[PDB]
Amino acid sequence: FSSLLQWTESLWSYIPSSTDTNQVMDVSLYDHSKITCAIASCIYDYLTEMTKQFYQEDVFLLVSLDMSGIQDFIYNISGSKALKSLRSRSFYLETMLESLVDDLLSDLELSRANLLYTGGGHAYLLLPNTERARDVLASFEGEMKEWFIKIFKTDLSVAIAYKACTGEDLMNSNGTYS
RNA sequence: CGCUUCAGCGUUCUUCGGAAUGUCGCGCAUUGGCA
């Protein structure tokens, strides 16, 4: 599916989600498909956990992870070899962030569609509200919290927090999204 | 038999241009970088 999700992104980025419509065509078809695919998996996991009333109940979790001391780590250079270190240290933090995201999605059995957006040193993911997914976050955070301690003794850290959000919250009904 | 008046006067007193220019405006070695 990962190759398919890349395939959609390359072609459907220019395509608008809705055409010849009064509302703004500010959403791409790939974005519309990606959000639908991510939400569909989230709903399925909740149902496996076991319309208008469906929106009211809390079916999704808002989960974000942020690295700590990323800017301190980049300039940790002695300066004996600073030009190469600065480039690679930033790259390592960027790729290590992707590795953490991929590891979390693999445990939850979710595609890259669930990663709604990323910022340097940060990840923004949409996950099902199922208690099984909540258990994984406890396991995943504890695993990566110990791994960073093993490798970087307080030089780097990650924290994960999850907030339960209902279906209407995603639609931004009553301004609850922001 | 000389005597006297006059003893210099009026008028230019410097002028017109150039008023600095061109060249260099830190370099090297160590630090860095690359191997």
Swiss-Prot record:
Q: Give the source's domain of life in one word.
A: Bacteria
Q: What is known of its domains?
A: The N-terminal HD domain has ssDNase activity. The C-terminal GGDEF domain has the cOA synthesis activity.
Protein family per UniProt: Belongs to the CRISPR-associated Cas10/Csm1 family.
Q: What does this protein do?
A: CRISPR (clustered regularly interspaced short palindromic repeat) is an adaptive immune system that provides protection against mobile genetic elements (viruses, transposable elements and conjugative plasmids). CRISPR clusters contain spacers, sequences complementary to antecedent mobile elements, and target invading nucleic acids. CRISPR clusters are transcribed and processed into CRISPR RNA (crRNA).
Instruction: Look up the further comments and give them.
Output: Encoded in a type III-A CRISPR locus.
Listed under subunit, the entry gives:
Part of the Csm effector complex that includes Cas10, Csm2, Csm3, Csm4 and Csm5.
What name appears for this protein in its UniProt entry? CRISPR system single-strand-specific deoxyribonuclease Cas10/Csm1 (subtype III-A)
Q: Which organism is it from?
A: Enterococcus italicus (strain DSM 15952 / CCUG 50447 / LMG 22039 / TP 1.5)
Q: Which gene encodes it?
A: cas10
The shown residues of the full protein are: 176 to 368 of 755
